Amino acid sequence: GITGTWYNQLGSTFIVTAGADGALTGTYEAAVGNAESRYVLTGRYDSAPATDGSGTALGWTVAWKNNYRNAHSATTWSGQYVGGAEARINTQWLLTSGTTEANAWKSTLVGHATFTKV
Amino acid sequence: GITGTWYNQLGSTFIVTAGADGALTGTYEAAVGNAESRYVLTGRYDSAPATDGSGTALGWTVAWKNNYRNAHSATTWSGQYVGGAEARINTQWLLTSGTTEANAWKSTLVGHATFTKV
Amino acid sequence: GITGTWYNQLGSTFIVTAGADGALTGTYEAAVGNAESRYVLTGRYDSAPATDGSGTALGWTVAWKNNYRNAHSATTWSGQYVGGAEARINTQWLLTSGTTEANAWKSTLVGHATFTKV
Amino acid sequence: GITGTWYNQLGSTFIVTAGADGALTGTYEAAVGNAESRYVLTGRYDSAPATDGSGTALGWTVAWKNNYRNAHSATTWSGQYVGGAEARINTQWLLTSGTTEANAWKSTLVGHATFTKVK
Ligand SMILES: O=C(O)CCCC[C@@H]1SC[C@@H]2NC(=O)N[C@@H]21
Ligand SMILES: O=C(O)CCCC[C@@H]1SC[C@@H]2NC(=O)N[C@@H]21
Ligand SMILES: O=C(O)CCCC[C@@H]1SC[C@@H]2NC(=O)N[C@@H]21
Ligand SMILES: O=C(O)CCCC[C@@H]1SC[C@@H]2NC(=O)N[C@@H]21
Numbered sequence: 001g002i003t004g005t006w007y008n009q010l011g012s013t014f015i016v017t018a019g020a021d022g023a024l025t026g027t028y029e030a031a032v033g034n035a036e037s038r039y040v041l042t043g044r045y046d047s048a049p050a051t052d053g054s055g056t057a058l059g060w061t062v063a064w065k066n067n068y069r070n071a072h073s074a075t076t077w078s079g080q081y082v083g084g085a086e087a088r089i090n091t092q093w094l095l096t097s098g099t100t101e102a103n104a105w106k107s108t109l110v111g112h113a114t115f116t117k118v
Numbered sequence: 119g120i121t122g123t124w125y126n127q128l129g130s131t132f133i134v135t136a137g138a139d140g141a142l143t144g145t146y147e148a149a150v151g152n153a154e155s156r157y158v159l160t161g162r163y164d165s166a167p168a169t170d171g172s173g174t175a176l177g178w179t180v181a182w183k184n185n186y187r188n189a190h191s192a193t194t195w196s197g198q199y200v201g202g203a204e205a206r207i208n209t210q211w212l213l214t215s216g217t218t219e220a221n222a223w224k225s226t227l228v229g230h231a232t233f234t235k236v
Numbered sequence: 237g238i239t240g241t242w243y244n245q246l247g248s249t250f251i252v253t254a255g256a257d258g259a260l261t262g263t264y265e266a267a268v269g270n271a272e273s274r275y276v277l278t279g280r281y282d283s284a285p286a287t288d289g290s291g292t293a294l295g296w297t298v299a300w301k302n303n304y305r306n307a308h309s310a311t312t313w314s315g316q317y318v319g320g321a322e323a324r325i326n327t328q329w330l331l332t333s334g335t336t337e338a339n340a341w342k343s344t345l346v347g348h349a350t351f352t353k354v
Numbered sequence: 355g356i357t358g359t360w361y362n363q364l365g366s367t368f369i370v371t372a373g374a375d376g377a378l379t380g381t382y383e384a385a386v387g388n389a390e391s392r393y394v395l396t397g398r399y400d401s402a403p404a405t406d407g408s409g410t411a412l413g414w415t416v417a418w419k420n421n422y423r424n425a426h427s428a429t430t431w432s433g434q435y436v437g438g439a440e441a442r443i444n445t446q447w448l449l450t451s452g453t454t455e456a457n458a459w460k461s462t463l464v465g466h467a468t469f470t471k472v473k
Contacts (some may be wrong), residue, residue: 005150010459015351022158022181032459041158042141043194044181046216050190054216055225059179059194063140063162072168074159076177076194078212080225092346094196094210094464098164098172105364105386107198108171108210110328110448110464128341150341210464212346223246223268228330228346228446230466258394265413278377278396279430280417282452287428291452291461295430297413299398300377308400312413312430314448317460328448328462330432334400334408343409343434344446 001083002045002056006115014041014115016060022047026064034071035064055080055090073097077113085091089115120163120176121197123208124233130206132159132233134178140165146180151213152189153182163199173198176207191215195231207233237319238281238292240352250277250325250351253298258283264298269331270307271300281317291316294325309333313349325351355437356399356412360469368395375384376401381424382416388425388448399435405447409434409444427451431467443469 011031024043043060064071079091134144161178197209252262261278279296300307315327365385378397397414418425433445
């Protein structure tokens with residue numbers, strides 16, 4: 001259920017393939033941020049999630065460099081997939097920019113996002 | 119550089135190879151939590167960091183499933199490499215557990231960790 | 237705007253008073269977690285907000301001790317009030333438990349919540 | 355135990371009084387950030403902690419407005435006090451700026467800070 005195209009409320013587009021092994025592979029297109037076009041993403045997910053009614057833990061990273069720009073920054077999303085008619089991926093993310101040590105205290109933004117199929 | 123074997127204050131072991139395309143690949147061994155032995159990790163880093171003195175942004179993900187057990191959870195570390203005194207990776211992390219919907223509100227732990235090579 | 241009774245998605249109840257000097261006071265009632273009935277809260281808000289459509293920064297804290305039980309934990313919410321149309325308060329929160337040193341790595345939960353008066 | 359002057363690595367200084375009922379009151383002096391002079395802080399702490407060696411949960415807020423300036427932003431620190439020979443306050447913090455709706459995605463910084471009785 002994770003492989004495919006997912007959207008967040010901010011207008012970004014996450015295209016993923018979930019390998020049989022636990023790999024997450026794909027591209028991210030950010031609607032906001034110092035970004036343009038697609039960026040490589042790589043991640044991991046629980047390929048044998050709980051057999052009750054729990055989501056599927058996952059995580060992925062995008063470093064914000066591609067052929068057109070480099071934002072000298074990296075976002076990790078940590079969350080879980082919840083399947084069904086309104087499948088979704090509920091995440092929290094951390095966006096760290098490379099900084100001088102004097103500015104390291106403000107290197108990291110924190111946010112959250114729910115991704116959907118529509 | 120970032121390729122190498124790194125350790126945090128807890129004694130976990132992070133073994134990573136940074137590839138030229140921006141890929142991070144390796145294994146992670148947790149000194150605490152619902153884990154044993156090594157776990158696959160994958161992530162991304164800025165392959166062309168600023169020369170201005172800033173760190174190098176990166177992130178990586180561990181899904182806490184391997185051959186011996188499955189914690190149904192995933193941690194992402196978001197941070198920057200500092201090829202500084204000791205070189206170090208300063209991170210913040212998010213550990214998300216697959217939960218039921220009623221428990222999603224407590225799905226995610228947050229913490230921070232500095233890794234060094236000794 | 238801020239002064240009022242607010243609810244989050246979890247159905248918890250946030251009853252707050254904004255004093256004219258930047259003080260937030262009131263009670264919090266959690267619908268989930270190791271809590272029951274009302275808990276004291278206190279916090280601070282920007283009493284002279286930007287007047288450029290920006291939100292009103294604020295935060296508040298609940299220590300989860302009251303006459304009925306004590307969870308030995310405390311949550312802080314950090315967010316901004318957005319007035320107008322449908323007023324809401326958008327937050328991120330940090331729930332820290334008193335733990336031993338060895339368990340401090342898992343002492344803190346993070347989440348997010350939007351409060352509305354509906 | 356918590357009452358007194360506390361220092362972090364950034365050079366900021368936090369003065370706090372822990373009330374018997376659980377209130378935290380005082381001022382925070384930041385040494386980095388869009389900040390000058392002292393700022394009011396208020397918060398709460400577990401005033402009947404575990405005696406088992408476990409830390410004392412607590413949190414506080416600073417709205418970064420005082421008589422000298424206004425950063426239109428607020429920080430909350432969430433953490434636990436650990437007493438002893440080497441007392442400290444182990445925290446994580448969220449600093450939220452007021453922002454337009456379209457900028458909300460980047461409204462909040464996250465960080466961590468250990469406070470000590472000695473600089
Ligand atoms: O601005 C940068 O440093 C690079 C672009 C970051 C875009 C962020 S990642 C979190 C949020 N969700 C998105 O889809 N875009 C932003
Ligand atoms: O869900 C679990 O218990 C497995 C998580 C593994 C341990 C966590 S990840 C963050 C922190 N750093 C470590 O080295 N271990 C813990
Ligand atoms: O369980 C505890 O340690 C004390 C109660 C904490 C409840 C949390 S605070 C964040 C979230 N929002 C709520 O309304 N309840 C939970
Ligand atoms: O810049 C602002 O928006 C107001 C001041 C922010 C200062 C931050 S709060 C977290 C960290 N700890 C400090 O002592 N200063 C910074």
